[PDB]
Symmetry: D2
Subunit: 317 residues, 4 copies
């Protein structure tokens, strides 16, 4: 049987006997993703070049407005906004959404894959909403995922029931369920990180990478891929197995990627798919944030690969 | 004033006072590129998943380019990554051009929605003999036009001719390629290197040393960043837009590289040179290699001239 | 605030505190209508013409399959199917849907506007589902409407809350709320019927049309429009007012249009918009059917114009 | 072999060994038509209704800017413009284009079919370009035709080589040739006119319509169709045969449709398809215009039907 994103979400919502607030949340977000996708693929650019005589701001506005008007949110945290947005009282719902509206857009000049990342938490207080409602560990995530604007557009949605992948059919504007209850391979054959900054590596990362290229047990060398767009590399890791690293070093002891709207959603997708996600010191989902824009190191992917990196990390005390 | 690919090609054709065969050629390729883009973005996939109650993308892509080029009446010999032998166009549809193309490069990893692309190179048939596979064995210096479509976050067609390199963005709402970047030039020197460092144990010593100099510069300057998509069109386009260097070099297991000379290396080498970049195998210019086999491989190092020159200096230190 | 069809229906569903089944049905129909519009506009026609070396059947399959897989239906009546379709037990829901998957498609060779018409009933007995469950008067409709595939694609949805019009945005595949709680004019200036068959007219139809062209007083004669496609003529009647007639005569004493999936849904839309719909003898919505494909005469539109027609009709009785 | 609009025009152009100017014009016109088609279908309407927080004018701007920038035109007459537009000196070419950028858009509130109509002349005088260069009879047309934005978008192009029909495939933005060297039926079975003006009809029109409804020779009466959008009514006349009439009435004693960019292009298409187009007094294409927006009565379509009307017209002197 064919299934769509909206029908899938409604059926899971009905099973859970929920009120519908989360469904309204996701349906609005799905609409914003379709509008982002259309602009990313440059529909209407002929009018910009005068046929009749920005993108990351629009993406933020599309997500902000669709979530606000959904009546399911009260606090919105965005890569694009210095402070958390508080939904106006008459529009308030019970959910907090942290999102990166258009990740990778710094390099969109070369048409690199880009994506939208989102994580959804339930509000913690019964009081007036505040930024504190966004300062939850990832363990409390109710749902998370991302849209990948790659050769085609795909939305990956992770919840308690697992991870499901939906392909956007642009002919009809519907996300089609194409991969159900996906699980990452136990062990992959690809590592992904910016090796150009090797001069700064932590000793453990230097050693772990050394083992991928010159395996001690005669086994085959790993291949290397690094798009430089986090959603594209994390999605490749999910589909093919392997490991993705944006680790801590001396110049960046807490990493570069953002915990609330990059690290935590991807870790949740990974764990629901049977993978792992560590900062080196602890599971990503266990870091308790004190700032909405704080950074975290991240190593994630196939469990045998993350376990192997953690073994090397532990050897270096 | 707005410009489109078709309007661009016609006006250049009129300047040159040609017969129109090349314009008919490029317009047919353009049409195939839009149909490939439409299929790559998965338009209509809901029907494959039973919305009402089936071919492979690289086979469909090859059929699109083949049929549009045959039906243009502008071609006589067609070389495709997908066909062991050259296709010789039937007599009533024959024109004067030879086209080498990779209909969907990078589709090996299309399971992960990696950027993919179409690569093409266009030659004038040179002899009066009957057309045969031999007419495709010209060095890249003989290219009349070349370029690629990149199906990335957006679809873009990059067209290189003697007048320079021009970039056209596909507007999907109207199906037109809009000229968005005119006469593009690559930076003299970049800050990105691009290759599969996972296979370092097999590197040529010159490659090992050069990568060493990028990560640990002797002159203390900032280390280069590293990017490698694993899809040639995406990595080369980033090299063209941001500068730097792309390497797919020879080693002892692969003394002739892995990428194919006729429909991957030569078209990309040609685009790079028309943008003021460089493309070498280490031993010679990519465009000067005289091929003997239409599917033969070639090592390729390309990009910003200063970065490729620095590779050649290290490569020379290793004789 | 922007609104979509799915978001609108969800909000009305939560207001009514229903189970979610009707929302699941309408979301399924909406996906089907987007697929029909895409095919009607000839997406992919290049492949049928050899670039790489049915419409009403496809339309029927899209609606049947999306409704079946919705888990919201038990009996489906279609213009295309001789007998009612009974949904298999594992997919049965509580609604009966009568529909015309592609009305007007006989003349689609000239690219005339075409459309999809639907009507939704609640199954009334606990018996095994059967064709008899579709033989309810239109008064029993829970929801009805039509998709018009015209210069643009529009979904008109009528429920107890009134009539609402949604425009399909093809760039994102969403039905956008553009006209809320629409009402038809009290009196129009257009009449619509096939005047080519005047030799067969009932005397009352002949007299009423003669008065529209030759008014007894000084007022302006009505203009005439007849597309020949029911959804287009009825929709123009909705937007501009006036009267649409496909009446009974001696050769066709029960009319030509079908009651279940053409007359009743349109009659329902008209009455929720403040209009009227009569067979001449009684309201269309009060006819109790005895056959799923039975015909009914229909005269509909602005109430003053239908009342004026009934006055002439009664003069000849 | 598959064929497209651009490839067809290039191939016919090379056959004639022309310079390419007309091809550049028609290619520019095709580009504007696809943009008009996308706008008519409401692409991007979601942004007008706040998803992120004038059609006939846009249509005219698209055609004007695309034709000016083609370097193939020198004088442009548009339904939207009071005076002929004189192309600036550096962009002037040898062609004059009369066009209706969005015909029927008055009633687009009901999503009625609309269309673009065009006629193309070679400039005939050696004077400086002026409004007078647009005043040639339709006999002088080099090319003409129309785009119909109906259930699908279709371009009909008539030249000396005959009439050809191209279907826009919206998935790739290309006009696909689907009907080659089309000919109209010798006699049709549909008549088309606004019968609401019956009180103002000339005796010849009244008699002819009477003959369609009450045939003297026992034959079947014609059916009636009238969309009220000329491109839709004319296109149907071409595809199915029959007759289209817009005669003069009291509001319009010189007729209502405009000679330059409605009557002539359609008359030209009709004659190249083996049909007919008369004012009653003379062939439409032979009328010598004196004013760029002047009106004309028009009767057109299948030749046996237009000849039958002329018989009645001669009977009434
Ligand atoms: C981990 O995710 C838990 C699963 C849940 S729970 C919700 S919900 O709370 O929004 N409830 C509902 O939507 N109920 C409904 N009733 C009728 C309709 Br028609 S939808 C959504 C999802 C995806
Ligand atoms: C390096 O390439 C040189 C540039 C060239 S030369 C040609 S051509 O040979 O095809 N000639 C023509 O197209 N003539 C025409 N006449 C009228 C029209 Br309308 S187009 C195409 C291009 C892009
Ligand atoms: C005659 O009906 C008019 C009003 C109604 S009642 C229904 S319903 O029965 O399907 N109930 C629901 O959809 N409940 C929901 N809960 C959560 C979500 Br989220 S939707 C749909 C409509 C449009
Ligand atoms: C009066 O209609 C006769 C048919 C004609 S003649 C012209 S034209 O004058 O524009 N010439 C050309 O287009 N030449 C070209 N050379 C190369 C390419 Br490729 S096209 C267009 C059409 C449709």
């Amino acid at each position: 049987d064919v299934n769509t994103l909206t029908r899938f979400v409604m059926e899971e919502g009905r099973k859970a006997r929920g009120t519908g607030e989360l469904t309204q949340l996701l349906n609005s977000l799905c609409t914003a993703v379709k509008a982002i996708s259309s602009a990313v693929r440059k529909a209407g650019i002929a009018h910009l070049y005068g046929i009749a005589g920005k993108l990351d701001v629009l993406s933020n506005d599309l997500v902000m407005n669709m979530l606000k008007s959904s009546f399911a949110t009260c606090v919105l945290v965005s890569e694009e906004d210095k402070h958390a947005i508080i939904v106006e009282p008459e529009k308030r719902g019970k959910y907090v959404v942290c999102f990166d509206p258009l990740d990778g857009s710094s390099n969109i000049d070369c048409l690199v894959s880009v994506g939208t990342i989102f994580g959804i938490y339930r509000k913690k207080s019964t009081d007036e909403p505040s930024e504190k409602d966004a300062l939850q560990p990832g363990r409390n995530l109710v749902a998370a995922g991302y849209a990948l604007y790659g050769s085609a557009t795909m939305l990956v949605l992770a919840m308690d029931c697992g991870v499901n992948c939906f392909m956007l059919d642009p002919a009809i504007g519907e996300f089609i369920l194409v991969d159900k209850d996906v699980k990452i391979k136990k062990k992959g054959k690809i590592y992904s990180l910016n090796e150009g900054y090797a001069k700064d590596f932590d000793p453990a990362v230097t050693e772990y990478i050394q083992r991928k290229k010159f395996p001690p047990d005669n086994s085959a060398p790993y291949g290397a891929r690094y798009v430089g767009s986090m959603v594209a590399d994390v999605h490749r890791t999910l589909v093919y197995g392997g490991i993705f690293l944006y680790p801590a070093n001396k110049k960046s002891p807490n990493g570069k990627l953002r915990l609330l709207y990059e690290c935590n959603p991807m870790a949740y997708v990974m764990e629901k798919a049977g993978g792992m996600a560590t900062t080196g010191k602890e599971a990503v989902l266990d870091v308790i944030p004190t700032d909405i824009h704080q950074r975290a190191p991240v190593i994630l992917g196939s469990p045998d690969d993350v376990l192997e990196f953690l073994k090397v990390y532990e050897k270096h005390s």
